[PDB]
């Protein structure tokens, strides 16, 4: 009696093993293979964060739990999850072609990145729809953003509350909250890309809900191109804020990311920790959503709301 629908879960993607590093970054670098020294460094970074194997598993677990949960909280639709990635197989097109072959005719998509941007989200959705249009007989409704879903805000608000609560007294009174997301080229502004504003809005909503009056907005993990990228970078912001007010502790909320991957386990947990360790301040970074029940419910609500349920 249920209506069959495809659940297209898209994401950036991650290597499955150390030997994937080369091709994964070549793709990210738009066809330019990393030099020998860079390849070695990347391997060292992944080893330092506990290994690669767990990365892709988080995404698979996210897609799977979301599929099971949605199927349990409503009784009108039966969802079937398909993972589509940008930088490694299964690619976005591959997932769409599979849904078609399996007989899916109606699907709903969601990107594992809360803020809309013309660079990624719009591109992912555009590519999924074009593949479906090319195959025919299949339509897709795409979630464009969900950073403002109350349940998602609540997740971070609660994590931040716990973090400040566990803080000593003299730290709680001189702590700074830094909310960040993946940095992108500044040129996106020429299209009126709401990306920057959505990050600032997430920061305001999380700070307000947690009761934190002192916070800043930062970017991280910027790529390497001649054109300028959104700033300031979390590393510089941390130092700059310290040099002007001398905070004793920094709380990092990489709201732009949803899992324990390299741009949090290393770009925050290591690179940011280096700076805080250097200035003599305490480092804090709340648990990422990953595949936890609270997060999966938030995502389920996002999907159902998109479908008018
Ligand atoms: Cl939407
Ligand atoms: Cl949006
Ligand atoms: Mg091996
Ligand atoms: Mg919206
Ligand atoms: Mg970097």
Swiss-Prot record:
Residue numbers binding N-methylmesoporphyrin: 12, 30-32, 182, 187
Biochemical pathway: Porphyrin-containing compound metabolism; protoheme biosynthesis
Entry keyword Iron: yes
Main location: cytoplasm
Subunit structure: Monomer. Interacts with frataxin/Fra.
UniProt-listed PROSITE patterns: FERROCHELATASE (PS00534)
UniProt-annotated binding residues for Fe-coproporphyrin III: 12, 29, 45-46, 53, 124
Regulation: Stimulated by Mg(2+). Inhibited by Cd(2+). Inhibited by N-methylmesoporphyrin (N-MeMP) and 2,4-disulfonic acid deuteroporphyrin IX (dSDP).
This protein's name: Coproporphyrin III ferrochelatase
Enzymatic reactions: Fe-coproporphyrin III + 2 H(+) = coproporphyrin III + Fe(2+)
One Gene Ontology term, aspect cellular component: cytoplasm
Annotated phenotype, changing residue 12 to M: Changes the metal specificity of the enzyme. Can insert Co(2+) into protoporphyrin IX at a higher rate than the wild-type enzyme, but loses the ability to insert Cu(2+) and Zn(2+)
Phenotype upon gene inactivation: Deletion mutant requires hemin for growth.
Species per Swiss-Prot/TrEMBL record: Bacillus subtilis (strain 168)
Top enzyme category: lyase
Known EC number: 4.99.1.9
Ligand binding (Mg(2+)): 19, 45, 267, 271
């Amino acid at each position: 009696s249920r209506k069959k629908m495809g659940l297209l879960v898209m994401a950036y993607g991650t290597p499955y093993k150390e030997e994937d590093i080369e091709r994964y970054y070549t793709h990210i670098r738009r066809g330019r293979k990393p030099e020998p020294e860079m390849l070695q460094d990347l391997k060292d970074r992944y080893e330092a964060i506990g290994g690669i194997s767990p990365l892709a598993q988080i995404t698979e677990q996210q897609a799977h739990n979301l599929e099971q949960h949605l199927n349990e909280i409503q009784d009108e639709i039966t969802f079937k999850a398909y993972i589509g990635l940008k930088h490694i197989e299964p690619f976005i097109e591959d997932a769409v072609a599979e849904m078609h072959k399996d007989g899916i005719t109606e699907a709903v998509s969601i990107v594992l990145a809360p803020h809309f941007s013309t660079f990624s989200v719009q591109s992912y959705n555009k590519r999924a729809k074009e593949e479906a249009e090319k195959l025919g007989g299949l339509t897709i409704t795409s979630v464009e953003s969900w950073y403002d879903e109350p349940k998602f805000v609540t997740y971070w608000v609660d994590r931040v509350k716990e973090t400040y609560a566990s803080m000593p007294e003299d730290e709680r009174e001189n702590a700074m909250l830094i909310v960040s997301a993946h940095s992108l080229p500044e040129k996106i502004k020429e299209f009126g890309d709401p990306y920057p504003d959505q990050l600032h809005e997430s920061a305001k909503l999380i700070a307000e809900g947690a009761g934190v009056s002192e916070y800043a907005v930062g970017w991280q993990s910027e790529g390497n191109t001649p054109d300028p990228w959104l700033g300031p970078d979390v590393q510089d912001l941390t130092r700059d804020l310290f040099e002007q007010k001398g905070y004793q502790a920094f709380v990092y909320v990489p709201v732009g990311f949803v899992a324990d991957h390299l741009e949090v386990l290393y770009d925050n947990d290591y690179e940011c920790k280096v700076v805080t360790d250097d200035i003599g301040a305490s480092y804090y970074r709340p648990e990422m959503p990953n595949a936890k029940p609270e997060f999966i419910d938030a995502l389920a609500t996002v999907v159902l709301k998109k479908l008018g349920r």
